[PDB]
Symmetry: D2
Subunit: 258 residues, 4 copies
């Protein structure tokens, strides 16, 4: 309840899923949290539920929404210590020939450029507080995924960008790290599974993709984020895997040497 | 002179630098090579110089230029075996606060979406030939670089996209790999150094960034590309480092524990 | 003071340096800690200083010392929740031709087989508690170091072994992770620098090997260890870098393309 | 037939499997090859079959065997350009509690220290020729494997050692690289499968562990080795994956978030 007391945190896409788990973790650590989301329903309810959290409607693809998010955070709370760039989307499975350049651009706008824009606008305040940036990337940026060429590309970009910004901001004492989750049970995971021919089979396969034999929880990503913000003072430019071991060992990757 | 005989290769940005080195390597391997470049000067001269190479003016950010590149390759040579996505640019050093979202978008168009578009248009022909894709990424997509947030992000995206496409195309026997060069002495390296306060000092530091104590050559990237195309039949989704060991060991990263 | 309350932790090489920092972090988290060290001086003083810590003399290269360490931990505290394999050594800089197979074997005994032996003897108790293993590896296992072939090999082995054991123990709910520190200011760092022609210059170079421009502290490694034990329930088989960004970006690796 | 003409190559464990594939690749490249193996049957037959290959009986765990291997290579052929450290073994699947420290030591002697010893004895001659070292590691050193803690540890050590030695030998122009194969169909793979309850099912699972849907061939590892020796002049300290994409994407790693 005190490991991040007195600090101010902005969490994008904080209204549900991983984002909401991160919001809860920071509130439980003693921080004041600004919940940003493009949808009102979940975030407004979270503000009512959590003392110390407030909701600001903000679409991270709209530069002027983000400018207002930062200026309102400063106006209302007087400082900014941590930005968690969690807002993002995973399209339904798409074969490469079914993707389009314009859809790829749209996904870059959310998953990459929204993170870039908030980080840019926040950095002057993070420099004053020697604060930090946490980007939510994905394991599939590192190892790939089938039927997700645009999505994978956007998360490879986020992870690499994290390292570049870590280098640039290190002289100011501002750390920049990312978390790469694997399969986390969220409303988006459930929505994507519902599109599949056999949603139950898709969910079971998702559980068995981890040696631990289950998917992860938003609270587990949130704990990793609170660690990076509050106790990882010699960590910058790292990719913290929260994946249950999915990247480890041999598995079933195809549907003796010729 | 025969390890890739009878094969047809498209190299983007092939008029100078790494691209020209890759063109020469494939011609020396027995392949017919289509040189794509947005500038005429170097590529036209290379066609005249190299039997088995032809030049097609093509800006990879212009979807209709790329469609014509593919249709002309097929019309003129009857097949397509390998696409080398080398066209790309590195901006001058830019602090994060000096970058813009619109400049970031423009760099994504070249370094990422041009690779995406040519690959998409070529894949039906690569499936017929069980051909392969080689993307030219960068070491800095993996380890970051200072004063290059947009550039680093684009190359992290290329490397990740390579793995995603490798997964999607594996059932068709089409391999997708990337080469991540470190410091290669090219006209772009020389142009970037010329912008610096002490170009000679910048070049010397660039040589000493490798344990081998020199920069690499376009011919060395070209040899790696010919290997991936012609002899790496069990390699897909790999990142082949051509860096002289720059990623190894401790070095000077800042300008005792507090 | 409560995030790991009621838990029992064994820290090898806990008498000074990183090990002592890890001991302090776990005591501050509410755990009871068994300090193992082959030397009495530091560990005995730490027991006197810290309520909740006790010292057991134990050389991790001596299988019967380690058996007694585990049986005494269980006899005295009734459970075992976390083993931190920190005991290890870095020889003075040695050129490859100056190393010997027998010295390499001796270093494997400490840095690798001591970790293996304690982990093996502890695992039946860790299974009962759904506890976890934390191995202290090194960044140089991942990126190499000059004049340290045997040492680097031992830490590459520890990091890989961590992943293998994570796979094997995942069905039992026992997580296995490692921390890879970079330059941490410890008595061993100071001892190694004292051997050099210009110790002050060696220390300054060690500080500048990180973008953050300083070395790390034992307390920072300790915080990472407490995170892995207490709050990283979906992390297994990970390598948590505590390096200040030393692996990022280009640096000086040698003492333009030919 | 000329890309490595005039060069002399030593391949350990060259009598069958990957080693024999590497021997054949180097002979086909124009090199003279010394086949080292502890068993006579396969290697003696290979000498008879291949002009330009000779067989020397040599157990790489016996330091005096290795000294004789190097001195006989020099006596007979006058130079040494490349050492391929391929000799190694994978034990049957073993749960961690079924392993022993003494078995772990024995496996380190072969998989790690044999590579170390030959490399050490060869380096004075490799310096004279600006030759290179190729170590055969494994993908599982990087990602782990179930029921193979000692084996995985030895290959993590080989990969890390490769990078350390690359750093140390870079001032002399001697490159040191490794190849990490995934599932390669060899007599050892077949022997290991024969131990399993359902060998046919084990082999099928091994094929499906790669997105390419087959295992690799010794010839494919051999081609990668010839590339590293003959055409990778700016590559040092790299890990060249020859895995068919096994490390990519999600798969089946266990036998929704709790
Ligand atoms: N769930 C997983 O398994 C998983 C795995 C790896 C990475 N991730 C990443 O974690 C993040 C959250 O994923 P999730 O599963 O919780 O998703 P989710 O869809 O359940 O929640 C995302 C939230 O972000 C909000 N959001 C979307 N677009 C926005 C925009 N333009 N501006 C502001 N808010 C916006 C949504 O309204 C929603 O509240 C994403 O970046 C995703 O790529 C998720
Ligand atoms: N030189 C290095 O050290 C280095 C290191 C890592 C990666 N790379 C990558 O290698 C590639 C080539 O780099 P280089 O140093 O040879 O650069 P370069 O500028 O010397 O050559 C690039 C070529 O691409 C062409 N090109 C640029 N934009 C194009 C477009 N829209 N359409 C078609 N052609 C276009 C240029 O006209 C030029 O001929 C780039 O992708 C770069 O990011 C270079
Ligand atoms: N200091 C760094 O920069 C650094 C960096 C990366 C990794 N590491 C690793 O961190 C660990 C601790 O390093 P440090 O710098 O604190 O070293 P240190 O020498 O200061 O402390 C190590 C402690 O381990 C004890 N120890 C040594 N051999 C032992 C044995 N056989 N049995 C029991 N205890 C034994 C020593 O007596 C000492 O108290 C080591 O594994 C080292 O490889 C250190
Ligand atoms: N087959 C695979 O899928 C695979 C995958 C990854 C790595 N590897 C590695 O590739 C190498 C070769 O594996 P393989 O499958 O061809 O094995 P294999 O058992 O078929 O062949 C290995 C050869 O090495 C020889 N050898 C063994 N011990 C020796 C010693 N002490 N001295 C000299 N020669 C010795 C054997 O007699 C044999 O001829 C090993 O290092 C192995 O770890 C294999
Ligand atoms: O991994 C990611 O980054 C990710 C991000 C957001 C949500 C879920 C994930 C996991 C993979 C996702 O989950 C699916 C379910 C059904 C079909 C396709 C799916 O892909
Ligand atoms: O690494 C890359 O991908 C890359 C790509 C194209 C060209 C050169 C490079 C190397 C780094 C580059 O070279 C510079 C020289 C002067 C200032 C800044 C520089 O950055
Ligand atoms: O990195 C490691 O794992 C490590 C482990 C223990 C202690 C220190 C280190 C850092 C490198 C070490 O510090 C040196 C100082 C002078 C000469 C050589 C040195 O190497
Ligand atoms: O991956 C490696 O390094 C390796 C090395 C040598 C031989 C084979 C391999 C693949 C894994 C191996 O193949 C098995 C088959 C049956 C049971 C267990 C097995 O493990
Ligand atoms: O919708 C799937 C899951 O999403 C998570 O974000 C919620 O915390 C869970 O309550 C829910 O079961
Ligand atoms: O301009 C720098 C270098 O660029 C390379 O692409 C050319 O092959 C070299 O001749 C030239 O020295
Ligand atoms: O000896 C170097 C450093 O070692 C660390 O372990 C101690 O905590 C410090 O007090 C000391 O300055
Ligand atoms: O024994 C399995 C395989 O081993 C390989 O080394 C041989 O080249 C093959 O002929 C054989 O099928
Ligand atoms: Na509230
Ligand atoms: Na021509
Ligand atoms: Na005490
Ligand atoms: Na012969």
């Amino acid at each position: 309840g005190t490991r991040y007391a007195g600090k101010v945190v902005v969490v994008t896409g904080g209204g549900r899923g991983i984002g909401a788990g991160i919001v809860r973790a920071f509130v439980n650590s003693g921080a004041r949290v600004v919940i940003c989301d493009k949808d009102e329903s979940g975030g407004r309810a979270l503000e009512q539920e959590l003392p110390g959290a407030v909701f600001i409607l903000c679409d991270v693809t709209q530069e002027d929404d983000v400018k207002t998010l930062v200026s309102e955070t400063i106006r209302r709370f007087g400082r900014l210590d941590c930005v968690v760039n969690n807002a993002g989307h995973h399209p339904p499975p798409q074969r490469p020939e079914e993707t389009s350049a314009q859809g790829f651009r749209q996904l870059l706008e959310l998953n990459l450029l929204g993170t870039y824009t908030l980080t840019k606008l926040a950095l002057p305040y993070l420099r004053k507080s020697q604060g930090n940036v946490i980007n939510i990337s994905s394991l599939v940026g590192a190892i790939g995924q089938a039927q997700a060429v645009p999505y994978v590309a956007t998360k490879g970009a986020v992870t690499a960008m994290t390292k570049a910004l870590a280098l640039d901001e290190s002289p100011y004492g501002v750390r920049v790290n990312c978390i790469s989750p694997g399969n986390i049970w969220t409303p988006l995971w459930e929505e994507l599974a519902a599109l599949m021919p056999d949603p139950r089979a898709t969910i079971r396969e998702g559980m068995l993709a981890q040696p631990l034999g289950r998917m992860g929880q938003p609270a587990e990503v949130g704990a990793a984020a609170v660690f990076l913000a509050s106790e990882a003072n010699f960590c910058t430019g790292i990719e913290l895997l929260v994946t249950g071991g999915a990247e480890l060992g041999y598995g079933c990757k195809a549907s003796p040497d010729i």
